[PDB]
């Protein structure tokens, strides 16, 4: 059970479903006695370059202490979900707070 | 025919010939002109002056649309890289923007070799 950054961006059209994503996500994690130290939602933020057409996406920061199991089967949900655009999990090194 | 005012100057200077094409804000090309098309064969067109007259050649063929101002996107090094944009300005065109669009790959394709001279 290690930490994972996790910082995906949902399509601007599916912004009303975003608040729901965090629900199932946090639920699936807590289901396996997972953890959670930080969860931020910068909201519809500007983009650096025209990614998959359309400008400005909906970013949603994350920080969970889930095992290297439920986290591996997490990207499969993102890839399958055409709603979300990008996705990335990074390092571990203990947990953090606020910032950004 | 037509009557635009804002266009673009897509030039492509190389180590051999320099092609200049004045298009619109949509990129459909209104008129072009090469350094070789106006004569100068071989090293003759491989010079900055070849591009100078070339620009004037493209200019005296696109003014029919009343092109007041137009952007300029340079592409490809070699001669006629600076003298080219130095012509349109003296031709009577209102230079606005000048951006470089030289194809720079992040190391992908394999370049040639044969050059032992």
């Amino acid at each position: 059970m290690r930490h994972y950054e996790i910082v995906f961006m949902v399509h601007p059209d599916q912004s009303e479903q975003v608040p729901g994503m965090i629900e199932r996500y946090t639920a699936a994690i807590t289901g396996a006695e997972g953890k959670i130290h930080r969860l931020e939602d910068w909201g519809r933020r500007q983009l650096a370059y025209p990614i998959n057409k359309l400008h400005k996406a909906h970013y949603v920061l994350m920080n969970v202490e889930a095992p290297q199991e439920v986290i591996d089967e997490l990207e499969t949900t993102f890839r399958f979900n055409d709603a979300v655009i990008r996705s990335m999990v990074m390092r571990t090194k203990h947990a953090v707070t606020e910032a950004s | 025919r037509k009557q635009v005012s804002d266009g673009v100057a897509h030039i492509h200077a190389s180590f051999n010939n320099t092609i200049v094409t004045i298009t619109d804000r949509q990129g459909n090309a209104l008129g072009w002109a090469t350094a070789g098309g106006s004569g100068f064969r071989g090293s003759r067109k491989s010079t900055p002056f070849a591009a100078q007259v070339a620009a004037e050649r493209c200019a005296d063929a696109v003014k029919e649309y009343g092109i007041k101002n137009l952007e300029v996107m340079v592409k490809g090094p070699g001669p006629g890289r600076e003298s080219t944009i130095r012509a349109l300005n003296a031709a009577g065109f209102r230079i606005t923007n000048i951006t470089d669009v030289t194809p720079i790959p992040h190391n992908g394709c394999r370049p040639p070799k044969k050059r032992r001279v």
Partner: protein, 55 residues
Amino acid sequence: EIDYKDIATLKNYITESGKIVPSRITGTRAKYQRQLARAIKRARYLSLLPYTDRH
């Protein structure tokens, strides 16, 4: 520098074109140099730091 999210600190370590500035100018430290570069690489992917100014 010590992170990638702190773009407010990595925006002054890169040229206008986005190219990572060498330690020769920034005068940055050793271990801190690669870390600074490693942070930029992560930011770029997350669309935090444009790879080029062409955009």
